[PDB]
Design a protein around this ligand. Structure first.
Ligand SMILES: *[C@@H]1O[C@H](CO)[C@@H](O[C@@H]2O[C@H](CO)[C@@H](O)[C@H](O)[C@H]2NC(C)=O)[C@H](O)[C@H]1NC(C)=O
Ligand code: NAG
Ligand code: NAG
Ligand code: NAG
Ligand code: NAG
Ligand code: NAG
Ligand code: NAG
Ligand code: NAG
Lengths: 99, 64, 417, 49, 50, 50
């Protein structure tokens, strides 16, 4: 605490931001993209991944025939990013420098 | 040869909302132009040859 | 509710319209630095002349700001090289457009929504020539309205092609069918209930006026900020800045020449500091306004002249079209968008296999009536018999998980019988 | 805890201690007394008071 | 008697402070209705536990 | 003078951070709430989801 300088608390506490992020994650997991463009419509996640595959030119059957490999690759990638985020101190630099 | 424009004057003279303009005369038709003046009016050089002023033309009017 | 064999499909749609308001330019000013800090005084100007070329720099900065504002106004609206006119007969297939294009009765030649927006937005504009002036915008309000009306006529009578070459006419219901095909639903779902959609569209256009009659926060905030900054610059003339008085004439008359420069220079420094602060603040505000104007130009170029697949860039929901409207120092987009409603939940399956052959939908999804299986489009609900036309075969349903047994009709079979 | 030769103390501007009395010495921290801005919440003068 | 510099600086800093809240709100609050994941995590193989 | 310099620097930094926050909001809208066809707007490669 210095003379004449003060900091105001943020409007949205970190718990509320985490709640918003969790809501977005749950929506994008259980409803695809529909919840962002009207009422949320449920759809099984493999079927949503098939839709997303069909949205980049890859035929639908590719995912339904390589679902196990796709899931294993996704899990491995998620583990790898979680492990790598703690490797170098500069990973969050784009934030830290700001502060 | 150049033209002179004042900003706030109750003025080859030619009154203009952007201010009094002398050295150029206005024409009745309109062309797409390159020297902006203001208040929808603008000057240019045209063939003797002189500097003229006119309201801008938005484009070649056509109805489909 | 989420299950691995449950999908939800909307059986109805509502067409909504959303208003987005963006300021594209703010009023341009140009203060005379020499006159502002020296109220018609020869000795004041002589003293200032030795204070460097600050006044020229400030004038150049303000002139650049004004030029970039004219550029922003030109760039946001003048996206069309030609001026289009709506045909005299307003027969668009039930779409009542009489609220967006201008009416000839009013002398202002502005649409009712444009007129309401103009009337909504309002010392502030009377500083009494205290070394400052405002320059008129390069494009008048009438010319901006003409540009907006030309864009509107182009986007009504020519769809999206008028922004990509010559304008090709096309009936409005077929243009809306094209947009529906763009968002994903088949075009037939329009013609099957076109009249209904028209009414819905009209109703939406009939609401924003009331939604605008109750707001204009961005435009009003920009105008208020500019006016308040100008007023706080003008008001600073009355401060002493540590001198005997705030008036050059009084300090010159009361004090002798050689002992008044030491006190006039403090007032000069104070006035110059205030003017420099005003110029810097205006530069930052102009940068922000230019960013906003670039965003507005991008929105006008994508949402209006075509159909944007970006999720939340031209209104919430799937984007159908948009109509621009002028506003005092700003632009208001009415985004016409399509949102699903009245959904029903069925039990799905990734593919269906029979006689040792799988079948996946060509474009759509598999749903369950309860005892029978159907294939339907993604967004709208329209059951169809699962034939070999709607599905393609790949595999033997030994690797796909979730295969559901069923039969696929062959159109060739009845011919043999 | 300060080495028994100093008299003042500061990290940026001033937090001095060590009362200048030759008879008695004691370390006294110096801190402000919680200055702060004040805000006002109004529903609106035309709505309530 | 040095003018109204204090008011200008305070207004600018308050505007920045409010703009930060606006930034956070428009970045994160893209949905007006929060959702919850189902208790059963049968996503078909994909592991979202991280 | 020192306070004016600090305020001006803060205004510039706030403008830059506002631009970054607008980019973040655009990415959240077009990458999470849907699939984006913009090639390098969702990392390298063809975008699937976020
Ligand atoms: C998803 O990944 C997590 C990663 O932790 C797995 O959690 C493991 O759960 C087992 C069950 O007791 C523990 O023994 C392990 O220690 C946990 N961690 C790891 C790294 O294995 C989880 O099992 C995975 N699958 C699901 C369906 O959540
Ligand atoms: C400008 O001069 C004309 C001609 O004398 C006069 O009719 C008009 O009222 C004047 N306008 C102003 C604003 O002084
Ligand atoms: C424009 O037309 C009017 C009306 O006939 C006329 O008085 C005027 O002189 C014309 N302008 C020029 C430059 O001749
Ligand atoms: C969709 O909702 C509108 C709302 O008025 C209704 O008129 C229409 O009948 C609904 N659609 C169907 C297929 O019932
Ligand atoms: C399946 O469709 C038939 C059509 O004849 C209908 O009678 C039946 O009610 C539907 N199944 C369910 C569970 O509604
Ligand atoms: C769905 O999950 C249930 C477990 O509750 C399982 O019995 C069933 O076989 C699964 N079906 C599919 C198609 O994955
Ligand atoms: C589908 O039919 C095949 C052979 O006719 C059979 O092996 C399989 O079990 C059937 N599927 C179900 C879910 O009964
Ligand atoms: C406040 O409410 C009254 C009551 O309708 C209304 O007349 C007035 O315009 C509103 N605003 C102000 C600033 O008083």
């Amino acid at each position: 605490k210095f003379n004449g300088l003060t900091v105001l608390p943020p409007l949205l506490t970190d718990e509320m931001i985490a709640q918003y992020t969790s809501a977005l994650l749950a929506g994008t997991i259980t409803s695809g993209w529909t919840f962002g463009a009207g009422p949320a419509l449920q759809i099984p996640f493999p079927m949503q991944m098939a839709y997303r595959f069909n949205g980049i030119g890859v035929t639908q059957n590719v995912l339904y025939e390589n679902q196990k490999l796709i899931a294993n690759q996704f899990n491995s990638a998620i583990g790898k990013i979680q492990d790598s985020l703690s490797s170098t101190p500069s990973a969050l630099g784009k934030l830290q420098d700001v502060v | 040869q150049v033209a002179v424009l004042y900003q706030d004057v109750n003025c080859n003279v030619f009154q203009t909302r952007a201010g009094c303009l002398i050295g150029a005369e206005h024409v009745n038709n309109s062309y797409e132009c390159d020297i902006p003046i203001g208040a929808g009016i603008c000057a240019s050089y045209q063939t003797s040859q002189s500097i003229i002023a006119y309201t801008m033309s938005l484009g070649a009017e056509n109805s489909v | 509710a989420y299950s691995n064999n449950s999908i939800a499909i909307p059986t109805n749609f509502t067409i909504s319209v959303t208003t987005e308001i963006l300021p594209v330019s703010m009023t341009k000013t140009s203060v005379d630095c020499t006159m502002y800090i020296c109220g018609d005084s020869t000795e004041c100007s002589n003293l200032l002349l030795q204070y460097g070329s600050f006044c020229t720099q400030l004038n150049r900065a303000l002139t650049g700001i004004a030029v970039e504002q004219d550029k922003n106004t030109q760039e946001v609206f003048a996206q069309v090289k030609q001026i289009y006119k709506t045909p005299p007969i307003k027969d668009f297939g039930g779409f009542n457009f009489s609220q967006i294009l201008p009416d000839p009765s009013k002398p202002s030649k502005r649409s009712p929504i444009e007129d309401l927006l103009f009337n909504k937005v309002t010392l502030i504009c009377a500083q009494k020539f205290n070394g400052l002036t405002v320059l008129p915008p390069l494009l008048t309000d009438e010319m901006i309205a003409q540009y907006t009306s030309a864009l509107l006529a182009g986007t009504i009578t020519s769809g999206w092609t008028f922004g990509a070459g010559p304008a090709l006419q096309i009936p409005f219901p077929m243009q809306m069918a094209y947009r529906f095909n763009g968002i994903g639903v088949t075009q037939n779902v329009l013609y099957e209930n076109q009249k209904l959609i028209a009414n819905q569209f009209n109703s939406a256009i009939g609401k924003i006026q009331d939604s605008l009659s109750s707001a204009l926060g961005k435009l009003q905030d920009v105008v208020n900020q500019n006016a308040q900054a100008l007023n706080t610059l003008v008001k600073q003339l009355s401060s002493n800045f540590g001198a005997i008085s705030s008036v050059l004439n009084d300090i010159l008359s009361r004090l002798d020449p050689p002992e008044a420069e030491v006190q006039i220079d403090r007032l000069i420094t104070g006035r110059l500091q205030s003017l420099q602060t005003y110029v810097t603040q205006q530069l930052i505000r102009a940068a922000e306004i230019r960013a906003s104007a670039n965003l507005a130009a991008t929105k006008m170029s994508e949402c209006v002249l075509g159909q944007s697949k970006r999720v939340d860039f031209c209104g919430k929901g799937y984007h159908l079209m948009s109509f621009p409207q002028s506003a005092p120092h700003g632009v208001v987009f009415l985004h016409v968008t399509y949102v699903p409603a009245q959904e029903k939940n069925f039990t799905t399956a990734p593919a269906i296999c029979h006689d040792g052959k799988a079948h996946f939908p060509r474009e759509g999804v598999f749903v369950s009536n309860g005892t029978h299986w159907f294939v339907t489009q993604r967004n709208f609900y329209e059951p169809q018999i699962i034939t070999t036309d709607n599905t393609f075969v790949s595999g033997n349903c030994d690797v796909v998980i979730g295969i559901v047994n069923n039969t696929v009709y062959d159109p060739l079979q009845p011919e043999l019988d | 805890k300060f080495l028994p030769f100093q008299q003042f103390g500061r990290d940026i501007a001033d937090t001095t201690d060590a009362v200048r009395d030759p008879q008695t010495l004691e370390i006294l921290d110096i801190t402000p007394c919680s200055f702060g801005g004040v805000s006002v919440i109004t529903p609106g003068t035309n709505t309530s008071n």
